[PDB]
Design a protein around this ligand. Structure first.
Ligand SMILES: O=S(=O)(O)O[C@@H]1[C@H](O[C@H]2O[C@@H]3CO[C@H]([C@H]2O)[C@H]3O[C@@H]2O[C@H](CO)[C@H](O)[C@H](O[C@H]3O[C@@H]4CO[C@@H]([C@H]4O)[C@H]3O)[C@H]2O)[C@@H](O)[C@H](O)O[C@@H]1CO
Ligand SMILES: [Br-]
Ligand SMILES: [Br-]
Ligand SMILES: [Br-]
Ligand SMILES: [Ca+2]
Ligand SMILES: [Cl-]
Ligand SMILES: [Cl-]
Ligand SMILES: [Cl-]
Ligand SMILES: [Cl-]
Ligand SMILES: [Cl-]
Ligand SMILES: [Cl-]
Ligand SMILES: [Cl-]
Ligand SMILES: [Cl-]
Length: 465
């Protein structure tokens, strides 16, 4: 039929300069590069939050996490009891469910991080099939983590880390035997073949945990980078390379089943690279978690041979929030009544090279221990507050590294963008959970969120003398 298949390939903590098509000089990603070159590379792509849980929530709900109560990560080994509601609210309908109701065969593979209790399970949230783990990460070698899991059960460990838990397949044990990146690639191939056999459009949410810690890589991938002297960089490159291998096999499967031409492949990272653990975000400033560009500006391409031209670069800013309305539009799917969305259906803009966010803002706000980091972009201009320092105004097109603070030269533009961003925060909800005890103390006493203090300007720079 006319409706395209959709494959999201979502990496975890992949740095900005860590794929070939986005600038890498040491990591080799020929299969991803080939896809990017045969479609549209997005040079100003943003995720809705600079860390996983809230970013993933935003991709699947189509709303900023500040509107859904999900702006902090779930903790390690979060409650698996429905009564504790440790998960994204069930009332916020996921794009997977919408696609499933419109006749797609739907599959999620890899990392979830959206709730470990039954009501939050992928199979309850629109996925016909799920293969992966429910929490925030996982050790990569089954021979290693299955030994550790059994050994800790035998020792009577009452709090085994979910990183070594057996993975699952629709709620049954997975009995994985491969390096799990290779396993996730295998399950993607299989689900592509199932969709081909059913003669049904597919939506596959392939959430590799690579290159997220722990840095663990196959010897055969390491040898591709054996000369790289920094052991972290060497292992990380091999981890990314393994994803690239899997994408190459997925691509051959799509061609063999004749689904390649009419499949939209979207590749991105859930957030910026963590430069403490192998990642490189050049030329951006900062690291995973920041509201510098480095925390939430990510590599992205769209690949869809039927519609998207080759060698395209799309330079206008876009959001991972656009995936929900764009995909449901492509699926000719009807949104549930009352569903709220923060992004736009951008596919016509990509095809015509027009500006979807013209005179509109793409935002980040990240909660810290007593203050807020903020970023906000319109057109060529961005405002940033990091570490509760004085506000910065950057021409992000001219100054991608956020080095030249123009707040003094153009104070009206600064204040203009502040006012719009402060108005945005008036729609926020309270978090359903926070992350640390410190967090809970600050919110309970009203020290957080204090958006009013976040949007102070002149008193941060004026001298009292
Ligand atoms: O690894 S060891 O040093 O041996 O200790 C481990 C374990 O420590 C790890 O926990 C996580 C897995 O690797 C890193 C180690 O510190 C951690 O990475 C974290 O993964 C999370 C997802 O599972 C998140 O990505 C997390 O990042 C977040 O951190 C906070 C919360 O939200 C923001 C930020 O505010 C986000 O960036 C990331 O750091 C240790 O916990 C355990 O005690 O011992 C193990 C060894 O047995
Ligand atoms: Br749902
Ligand atoms: Br397993
Ligand atoms: Br860290
Ligand atoms: Ca991440
Ligand atoms: Cl453990
Ligand atoms: Cl084809
Ligand atoms: Cl740091
Ligand atoms: Cl064409
Ligand atoms: Cl700085
Ligand atoms: Cl001005
Ligand atoms: Cl709270
Ligand atoms: Cl002020």
């Amino acid at each position: 039929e006319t409706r395209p298949n959709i494959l999201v390939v979502l990496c975890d903590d992949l740095g900005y300069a860590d794929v070939g098509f986005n600038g890498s000089t040491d990591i080799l990603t020929p299969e991803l590069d080939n896809l990017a070159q045969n479609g549209s590379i997005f040079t100003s792509a943003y995720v809705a939050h600079p860390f996983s849980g809230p970013s993933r929530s935003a991709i699947l709900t189509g709303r900023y996490p500040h509107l859904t109560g999900t702006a902090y990560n779930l903790f390690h080994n979060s409650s698996e009891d429905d009564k504790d509601n440790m998960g994204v609210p069930v009332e916020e309908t996921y794009m997977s469910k919408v696609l499933q109701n419109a006749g797609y065969y739907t599959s999620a593979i890899g990392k979830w991080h959206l709730g470990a209790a039954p009501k939050f399970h992928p199979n309850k949230r629109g996925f016909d099939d799920f293969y992966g783990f429910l929490g925030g990460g996982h050790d990569y070698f089954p021979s290693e983590y299955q030994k550790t899991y059994k050994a800790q059960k035998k020792a009577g460990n009452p709090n085994i880390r979910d990183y070594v838990f057996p993975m699952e397949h629709n709620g049954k044990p997975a009995n994985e035997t491969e390096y799990i990146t290779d396993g996730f690639s295998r399950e993607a191939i299989k689900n592509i073949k199932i969709a081909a056999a059913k003669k049904q459009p597919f939506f596959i949410y392939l959430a590799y945990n690579a290159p997220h810690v722990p840095l663990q890589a196959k010897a055969e991938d390491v040898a591709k980078f054996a000369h790289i002297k920094d052991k972290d960089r060497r292992t990380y490159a091999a981890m990314v390379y393994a994803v690239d291998r899997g994408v190459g096999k997925i691509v051959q499967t799509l061609k063999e089943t004749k689904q390649f031409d009419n499949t939209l492949i979207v590749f991105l990272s859930d957030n910026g690279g963590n430069f403490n653990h192998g990642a490189n975000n050049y030329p951006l400033k900062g690291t995973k978690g920041d509201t510098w560009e480095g925390g939430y500006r990510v590599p992205m391409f769209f690949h869809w041979p039927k519609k998207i031209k080759k060698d395209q670069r799309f330079d206008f800013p876009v959001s991972s929030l656009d995936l929900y309305p764009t995909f449901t539009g492509l699926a000719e799917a009807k949104l549930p009544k009352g569903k709220q969305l923060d992004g736009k259906n951008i596919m016509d803009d990509v095809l015509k090279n027009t500006e979807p966010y013209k005179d509109e803002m793409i935002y980040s706000l990240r909660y810290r221990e007593g203050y807020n980091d903020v970023g906000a972009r319109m057109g060529d201009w961005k405002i940033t507050r990091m570490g509760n320092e004085p506000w910065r105004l950057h021409n992000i097109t001219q100054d991608i590294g956020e080095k030249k603070n123009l707040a003094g030269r153009y104070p009206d533009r600064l204040k203009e963008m502040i006012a719009k961003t402060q108005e945005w925060t008036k729609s926020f909800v309270k978090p359903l959970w926070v992350y640390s005890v410190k967090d809970k103390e600050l919110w309970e006493s009203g020290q957080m969120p204090n958006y009013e203090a976040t949007f102070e300007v002149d008193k941060l720079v004026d001298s009292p003398y």
